[PDB]
Automatic annotation (TrEMBL):
GO terms for molecular function: carbohydrate binding; hydrolase activity. GO terms for biological process: carbohydrate metabolic process. It comes from Bacteroides ovatus. SUPFAM superfamilies: Galactose-binding domain-like. Residues 761-892 form the CBM6 domain. InterPro entries: CBM6 (IPR005084), Galactose-bd-like_sf (IPR008979), GH98_C (IPR013190), GH98_central (IPR013191), Lyase_8-like_C (IPR011071). Keywords: Hydrolase. The keyword S-adenosyl-L-methionine does not apply. The keyword Protein biosynthesis does not apply. This is Glycoside hydrolase family 98 domain-containing protein. It comes from the Bacteria.
Length: 894
């Protein structure tokens, strides 16, 4: 956010500078559009970076017609550039023209509004009053910037200022060939993924989020770089994530430095990056370079996450959902070329049936082909963000994958999916323990290879604390895991890694599932053609207290006897056609809508494996058992592999368990973690033992546990009080021979690292350790300085005791170039020194920079780094001649 008068003068100062660059034969290193080309940032070969505005801020007042604002431009005459005002020469006293390039100043004509409310223009001592200013929308003096060929870059104006071409810098570094062909980082049951968010809402230092993830988890992790689509509804402009490209770039470099996988620019229609309609645009269109760039330069980049694609379409500043699907059609090809994933996540309401994962492939036949053909690259995820329809949306998201249109299936859980005011069981606020249930249920019984989140990131995963002292009198920003992150999430993944929780393959799920619905309906409302049959789940796994479809407010199943029921558009391949029972929805209203008849046919397909009010589903020798109701709840489960007779289970509310049957052993992973520290009680009884059993228990993470044992009349009874997760082992043998046989250890394969990133590293000043600085801007959007990288910058300031430090890295020993992007608006700063590894190496030339709020500059140093960690400091020695600002540093090999 900024005033119209700032915007105008910025463009003028830019026009002066472009002309200066032209006659000094300077080159454009980089340019990039923002807010769909409302503004651009521009870097030249001398390191000068500045904004130009294609849209000007409204003029405070309220009026909203287009009205007059002065237009300072430039024409050429007798070989020379002179200032224009509204397409006539700019003159003051006499009729003397005024050169752009005058041998004394770098003062441009300044436009203003005086105190009688008239526009004015001043140039040194001279000054000129023009027309009355008037509240209204204004038009910019500048149109846009495009590229000509691969040589030229053109700046075009809206007045009669000529076009201005500058050469497009070519860098003499040999470009690094990208990764193509096969998938960069395969995902499968053997190689699952956790998407952990570096979140614009946490105002992250990516480096410190990465480090909060332990080593055993890291290799299975895919860091998800979240750009918030929070914006000003009137203008369109993004705040939280002001410069999305620049955040993504900065954090994607840190990821690439740390050799970890990474991928998120949209929520609903809103997106920091412009949608395409043709595959050609990925190379030919200077409005959409970001797509190719991330794949080309970062070998750890897996692609793009379009989350929550159910809202915000057809906005003034979004796109239609059709246009989005179309963008996916092209983007998916791009993704396939580079071995990437495109991820989509859906949560549902009544208004959004026509944009769900059925409609996705049923409404757009071209996307359907491109999806089918590159399913390996396409990942479809259930989101738990909306207030209803969870079983419908679970079926459909699962159906996408099994039917062959997506390669992997995932869950993105959210607190926000707890029912509002009343909640569930008598618990107003969402309790974290609840979250473990859907996830384990859908991972173990429906083949999810991707866990995403959980949300909200900043309530469930990480928070920033106050700054902390880190030696030598320096202080740093700091981040911490929430306890439920460690005690639910981290530990649940350890239980996948350690092969307790075996993820079934697609073909394994179809054999279990048995049945599919095909959505072959073309008549009726949006719900009739894209959503599942309304009473699909009734008298199956849907609770008594809950209701059908959009009155389905609870995601806990009443029973696990019947498997999650998938709903697809079509079956694309051999395997999808191996479904035992294919039911067309058109027949559904006739036959299956009678709840009793459905339950009758389903009962023949899916035998009773237990009784009681707990949730119990079995796959191979693994049970998921949980309690999603109030009060102690029970079940009687006859064993299928263990040689004892049966187990009777009695569990507290929101206790979840994973129970592995062995001929002479049982394991329980149990959890029910409350951060406030309460205990819960659980009771396990084994029947049919022909021997005194024994038991073993280990607490996990920050959990507690005590277990009591009771042998009596051939019943063995374990009483497990605990807070948080634990593994319990029961050695119990019986005398049965009618029992199945346990297959050998499922595979878990530790996912390979990405190739080593050979490009430049970046370290944002707002993440530096610091002492005695004037101001540290971690949330820049609300402050006066524009055109910065990531979310912020700092004002180092003039203190003689001012200093900063970060830890930087180097693939090996040698000379590197350190580019400090900075601002020195009032005076040159010759008074700050640089230390590498606690040895002073020079005094960067921080030349006076232009006063304008968008201008930054870059100061260079050559230095020796050694292989691995290096320490970087900037230290004042005296009082600065003026404020020094710092946005970042960028390190590259010479
Ligand atoms: O960048 C942050 C980023 O966000 C992600 O994480 C979460 C998000 O998951 C989520 O985002 C919110 C999603 O829900 C929006 O609310 C829904 C909007 O549409 C409403 O439907 C209309 C009802 O009336 C009808 O007549 C009308 O026709 C319907 O709309 C049309 O429906 C079909 C569409 O195809 C069509 O385009 C649309 O126009 C719907 O009822 C409403 O319901 C929501 O309420 C909750 C209930 O649990 C659910 O979110 C959903 O059911 C929501 O936007 C709302 O907030 C304001 C707008 O700012 C309005 O009230 C409404 O539009 C999204 O909110 C915004 O997300 C971005 C964030 O930066 C904003 O601050 C936030 O307001 O929840 C929040 C977010 O944390 C990423 O992981 C995270 O990094
Ligand atoms: Ca910065």
């Amino acid at each position: 956010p900024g005033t119209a008068v700032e915007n105008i003068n910025t463009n003028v100062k830019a026009l002066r500078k472009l002309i200066e660059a032209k006659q000094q034969d300077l080159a454009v290193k980089t340019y990039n559009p923002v807010n769909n080309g409302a503004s651009y940032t521009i870097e030249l070969s001398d390191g000068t970076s500045f904004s130009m505005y294609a849209q000007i801020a409204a003029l405070e007042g309220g009026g909203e017609d287009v009205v007059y604002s002065p237009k300072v431009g430039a024409k050429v005459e007798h070989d020379e550039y002179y200032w224009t005002l509204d397409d006539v020469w700019l003159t003051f006293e006499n009729d003397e023209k005024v050169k752009v390039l005058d041998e004394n100043n770098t003062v441009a004509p300044i436009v203003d509004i005086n105190t009688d409310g008239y526009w004015t223009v001043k140039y040194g001592t001279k000054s000129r009053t023009l027309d009355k200013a008037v509240s209204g929308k204004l038009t910019s003096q500048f149109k846009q910037v495009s590229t000509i060929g691969d040589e030229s870059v053109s700046f075009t104006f809206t007045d009669r200022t000529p076009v201005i071409e500058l050469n497009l810098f070519k860098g003499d570094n040999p470009e690094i060939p990208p990764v193509t062909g096969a998938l960069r980082r395969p995902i499968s049951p053997e190689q699952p993924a956790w998407f952990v968010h570096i979140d614009s809402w946490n105002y992250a230092d990516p480096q410190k989020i990465i480090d909060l993830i332990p080593a055993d988890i890291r290799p299975f992790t895919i860091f998800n770089i979240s750009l918030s689509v929070s914006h000003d509804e009137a203008t369109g402009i993004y705040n939280v994530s002001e410069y999305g490209y620049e955040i993504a770039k900065s954090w994607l470099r840190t990821c690439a430095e740390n050799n970890v996988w990474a991928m998120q620019p949209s929520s609903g229609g809103f997106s920091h990056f412009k949608d395409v309609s043709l595959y050609s645009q990925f190379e030919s269109d200077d409005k959409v370079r970001v797509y190719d760039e991330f794949f080309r330069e970062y070998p750890n980049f897996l692609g793009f996450n379009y989350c929550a694609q159910f809202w915000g379409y057809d906005d003034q500043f979004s796109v239609s959902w059709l246009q989005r699907v179309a963008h996916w059609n092209q983007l998916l090809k791009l993704t396939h070329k580079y071995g990437g994933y495109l991820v989509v996540s859906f949560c549902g309401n009544t208004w959004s049936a026509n944009i769900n994962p059925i409609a996705l492939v049923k409404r757009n036949s071209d996307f359907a082909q491109t999806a089918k053909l590159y399913s390996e690259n396409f990942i479809m995820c259930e989101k738990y963000t909306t207030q209803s329809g969870f079983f419908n949306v679970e079926g459909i998201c699962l159906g996408t994958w099994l039917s062959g249109f997506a390669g992997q299936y995932g869950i993105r859980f959210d607190q926000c999916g707890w029912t509002e005011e009343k909640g569930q069981n008598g618990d107003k606020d969402f309790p974290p323990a609840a979250g473990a249930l859907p996830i384990i249920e859908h991972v173990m019984l429906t083949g999810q290879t991707v866990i995403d989140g959980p949300e909200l990131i900043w309530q469930q995963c990480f928070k920033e604390t106050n700054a902390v002292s880190v030696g030598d009198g320096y202080q740093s920003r700091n981040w911490e895991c929430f306890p439920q992150f460690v005690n639910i999430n981290i530990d649940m993944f350890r239980k996948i890694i350690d092969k307790t929780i075996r993820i079934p393959s697609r073909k394994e799920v179809i054999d279990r599932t048995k049945v599919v619905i095909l959505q072959d309906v073309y008549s009726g409302d949006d719900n009739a053609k894209y959503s599942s049959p309304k009473n699909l789940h009734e008298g199956l796994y849907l609770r008594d207290d809950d209701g059908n479809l959009w009155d389905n407010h609870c995601y806990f199943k009443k029973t696990g006897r019947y498997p999650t029921i998938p709903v697809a558009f079509e079956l694309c391949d051999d395997v999808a056609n191996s479904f035992q029972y294919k039911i067309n929805q058109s027949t559904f209203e006739g036959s299956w809508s009678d709840v009793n008849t459905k339950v009758g046919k389903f009962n023949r397909w899916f035998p009773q494996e237990y009784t009681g009010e707990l949730y119990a589903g079995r796959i191979e020798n693994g049970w998921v058992v949980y309690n999603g109701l109030a009060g102690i709840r029970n079940a009687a489960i006859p064993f299928k592999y263990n040689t004892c007779d049966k187990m009777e289970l009695a569990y507290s509310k929101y206790t979840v368990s994973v129970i592995k049957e062995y001929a002479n052993k049982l394991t329980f992973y149990m959890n029910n973690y409350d951060p406030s520290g309460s205990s819960k009680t659980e009771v396990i009884k084994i029947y049919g033992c022909t021997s005194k059993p024994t038991h073993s228990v280990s607490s996990r993470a920050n959990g507690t546990a005590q277990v009591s044992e009771n042998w009596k009349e051939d019943v063995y009874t374990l009483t497990v009080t605990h807070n948080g997760p634990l593994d319990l082992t029961v050695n119990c043998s019986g005398k049965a021979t009618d029992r199945l046989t346990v297959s050998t250890a499922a595979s878990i394969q530790v996912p390979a690292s990405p190739q080593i990133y050979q490009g430049a590293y970046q370290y944002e000043a707002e993440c530096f350790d610091f002492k005695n600085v004037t101001k540290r801007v971690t949330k820049g959007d609300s402050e006066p300085i524009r055109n910065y990288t990531a979310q912020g910058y700092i004002n180092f300031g003039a203190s003689s005791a001012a200093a900063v430090r970060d830890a930087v890295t180097a693939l090996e020993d040698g000379v590197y170039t350190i580019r400090i992007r900075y601002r020195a608006p009032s005076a040159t700063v010759n008074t700050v020194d640089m230390y590498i590894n606690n040895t002073k190496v020079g005094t960067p030339e921080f030349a006076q920079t232009d006063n304008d709020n968008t201008v930054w500059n870059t100061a260079l140093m050559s230095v020796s780094l050694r292989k691995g960690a290096n320490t970087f400091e900037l230290k004042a020695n005296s009082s600065g001649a003026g404020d020094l600002y710092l946005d970042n540093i960028v390190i590259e090999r010479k």
